[PDB]
């Protein structure tokens, strides 16, 4: 899944 700070 996407990193904690992505998007």
């Amino acid at each position, epitope marked *: *899944e*996407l990193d*904690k*700070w992505a998007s």
Partner: antibody
Framework: RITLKESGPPLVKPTQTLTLTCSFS??????????VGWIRQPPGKALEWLAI???????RYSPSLNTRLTITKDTSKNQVVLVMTRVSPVDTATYFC????????????????????????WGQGITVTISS | ALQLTQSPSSLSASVGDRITITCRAS??????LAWYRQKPGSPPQLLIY???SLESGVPSRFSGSGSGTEFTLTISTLRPEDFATYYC?????????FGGGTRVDVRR
């Protein structure tokens, strides 16, 4: 100045449980967005990401070692613990813990996430050998 | 998981030379990429973060560029302490995978 140091058993036998501790200073696990991760390196091989925990207690694990790993933090003692169950000879390696910056804030407001894209400070690492 | 391939896997060089190491991702990782230098017997050391930002305290010799699936680390004027192993790390997706590394040794 930020510093981290890994501690634990230099030798552990197969099937046993390995508990590694990361003691740090210079930052708190109550600081916004900060993380502490664990990376291993078998002798002569490449770095392998294991897990990470953040100040808000969010935790993430390597999908390959997920069932054998548990990461926890003790905010008050400035420590993070990684427990690896059922170790085997292949888990022999140098284990490093490292700090991850949280987003930069201005008067409390996050204004930059660029600093989170790296593990900026690493411990010296602790060598663990798994053999009966 | 996301695959990071460094190239070359090994590189020979001489003090004073300019070298470039590449890291390619199997999927785009935006700018969430870091470069580290690991001297023998020591832990990795952060050189570049967020693909191109120079980490405080790191000599200006090091610079990083690229985004998406293509990244490069370049050392202008290689120094003796630069003979080591370099790794790239991706932090856009979990797990935060590392490249296989690129060994830089003395050419002869």
């Amino acid at each position: 100045r930020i510093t981290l140091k890994e501690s634990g058993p230099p030798l552990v036998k197969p099937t046993q449980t390995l508990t590694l501790t990361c003691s740090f200073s210079g930052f708190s696990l109550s600081d916004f967005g900060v993380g502490v991760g664990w990376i291993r390196q078998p002798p002569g091989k490449a770095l392998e990401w294991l897990a990470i925990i953040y100040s808000d207690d969010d935790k993430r694990y390597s999908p390959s070692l997920n069932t054998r790993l548990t990461i926890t933090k003790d905010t008050s003692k400035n420590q993070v613990v990684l427990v690896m169950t059922r170790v085997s000879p292949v888990d022999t390696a140098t284990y490093f813990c490292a700090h991850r910056r949280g987003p930069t804030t201005l008067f409390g407001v996050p204004i930059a996430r660029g600093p989170v894209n790296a593990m900026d400070v690493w411990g010296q690492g602790i060598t663990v050998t798994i053999s009966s | 998981a996301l695959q990071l391939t460094q190239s070359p896997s090994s590189l020979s060089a001489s003090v004073g030379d300019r070298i470039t190491i590449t890291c390619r991702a199997s999927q785009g990782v935006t700018s969430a990429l870091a470069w580290y230098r690991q001297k023998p017997g020591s832990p990795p050391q952060l050189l570049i973060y967020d693909a191109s930002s120079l980490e405080s305290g790191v000599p200006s010799r090091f610079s990083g560029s690229g985004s998406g699936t293509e990244f490069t680390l370049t050392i202008s004027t290689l120094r003796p302490e630069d003979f080591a192993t370099y790794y790239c790390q991706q932090l856009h997706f979990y797990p935060h995978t590392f490249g296989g590394g690129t060994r830089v040794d003395v050419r002869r």
